[PDB]
């Protein structure tokens, strides 16, 4: 359905190994990846060209023995499960990779903030700069932040609990399959983006 | 460069000593005085004056058992619209009226309802002409205007509204 | 900032607009008795190797 002039810059790719990122995919996915990214994948061995027998079934990377000896039949339910596990791993990677910037007001050169950050604001910035929709109930502040919040100016962090991990089997690859560490950085911005 | 020398030379009598004797000293003195008094009148006198008035009204209310805070908030609620100067004048010269105001504020008397949005009558939706009479909404408005005329002040026109509405018939010449 | 006499406003309350230990009352007070040679009026609690 993609226009031909755009599709010229892509190529169909079957992912042999799960890769996180905007140009990645789960093991056994037919995906239109860009030319350079697909070249990198095929050079690293994490992807192949989608032949018909490969679309029927494909050998995938087995992390237990560190070899590509794990054959997988591409089924409807398998594609559904793999897409869901990929979504879980992807949101974990997004939340755990980078910082979360909060531009707020602070009177003078003080050490604290005027209005402390709450779980609503944390989820707002998550959706804003990570494109992640969550409910604020999953956010847990530190012990020093349970009372007021992220009122401290500078490098902060909190916990983000991700409940559905045991059903997908994400206990091994992730350092902690129950919660994520959300690095937060609050900056005194008196510019137009203060709003507080 | 203008320094108002000719205007300020007339008021050297109000000064004393060297400022009254010598012209330059008196001109400098009067210039400084006028500038500082202008500054004070512009940005400092009103604060002091309104603080005095507020203190007087607060003492008057404390003599009755309330304070300026509650009295002002309840005057705003009851919609009395009495400036602090008028409140002070009542407190000093009409203590009975000031106490009546305090009693009104302290009582559980319902404050006046908010202003009413102008409503359009049901006669506006009447098909006119229904197929030499006036529009029903226009006649209703004429009656309301006649009533509003007759409500304000006693006049010789009379308290009746129908005979006042039927005045073009009085001016009319019967064919 | 000084706004009152030592009876109403204490000497360490001048720095109340600053964050930190100046918003707490000190542990030691040398105002009463013999005046210090270096004129030290108050001393806060030792924060490690630093004392204010």
């Amino acid at each position: 359905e993609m226009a031909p002039e755009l599709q010229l810059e892509y190529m169909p790719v079957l992912f042999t190994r799960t890769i996180l990122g905007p140009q990645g995919g789960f093991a056994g996915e037919e995906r239109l990846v860009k030319l350079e990214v697909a070249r990198k994948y095929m050079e690293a061995g994490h992807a192949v060209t989608p032949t018909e027998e490969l679309r029927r079934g494909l050998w995938c990377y087995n992390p237990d023995t560190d070899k590509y000896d794990c054959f997988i039949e591409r089924n409807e339910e398998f594609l559904d499960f793999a897409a869901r596990k990929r979504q879980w791993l992807d949101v974990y990677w997004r939340v755990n990779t980078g910082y979360l910037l909060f531009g707020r007001q602070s009177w003078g050169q003080g050490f604290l903030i005027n209005c402390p950050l709450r779980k609503r604001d944390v989820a707002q910035k998550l959706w804003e700069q990570y494109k992640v929709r969550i409910d604020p109930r999953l956010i847990e502040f530190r012990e020093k932040d349970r009372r007021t919040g992220i009122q401290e100016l500078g490098h902060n962090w909190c916990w983000l609990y991700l409940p559905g991990a045991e059903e997908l089997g994400i206990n091994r690859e992730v350092y902690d399959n129950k919660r994520v560490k959300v690095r937060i950085h609050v900056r005194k911005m008196n510019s137009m983006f203060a709003l507080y | 460069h203008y320094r108002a020398k000719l205007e300020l030379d007339r008021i050297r009598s109000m000064l004393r000593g060297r400022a009254r004797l010598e012209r330059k000293v008196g001109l400098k003195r009067l210039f400084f005085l006028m500038r500082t008094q202008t500054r004070y009148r512009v940005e400092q006198q009103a604060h002091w004056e309104r603080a005095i008035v507020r203190k007087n009204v607060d003492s008057a209310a404390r003599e009755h058992g309330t304070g300026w805070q509650h009295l002002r908030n309840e005057l705003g609620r009851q919609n009395v619209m009495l400036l602090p100067r008028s409140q002070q004048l009542l407190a000093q010269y009409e203590p009975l009226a000031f106490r009546a105001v305090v009693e009104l504020c302290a009582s559980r008397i319902p404050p006046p309802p908010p202003p009413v949005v102008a409503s359009v009558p049901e006669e506006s939706y009447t098909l006119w002409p229904p197929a030499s009479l006036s529009h029903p909404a226009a006649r209703v408005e004429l009656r309301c205007g006649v009533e509003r005329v007759l409500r304000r002040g006693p006049s010789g026109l009379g308290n009746n509204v129908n005979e006042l509405i039927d005045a073009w018939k009085e001016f009319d010449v019967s064919p | 900032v000084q706004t009152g006499s030592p009876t109403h406003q204490r000497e360490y309350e001048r720095f109340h607009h600053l964050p930190g230990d100046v918003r707490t009352r000190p542990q030691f007070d040398f105002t009463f008795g013999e005046t210090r040679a270096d004129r030290v009026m108050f001393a806060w609690r030792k924060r490690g190797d630093l004392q204010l």
């Binding site: 003078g108 050169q109 003080g110 | 507020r54 203190k55 | 600053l18």
Partner: peptide, 24 residues
């Protein structure tokens, strides 16, 4: 306090107006 660390301080003239009494 509105002082701050970097901001310089000034000596404001004490407000000597007549204040209303507080209420319960």
């Amino acid at each position: 306090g509105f002082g701050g660390f970097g901001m310089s301080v000034y000596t404001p003239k004490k407000d000597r107006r007549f204040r209303v009494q507080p209420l319960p």
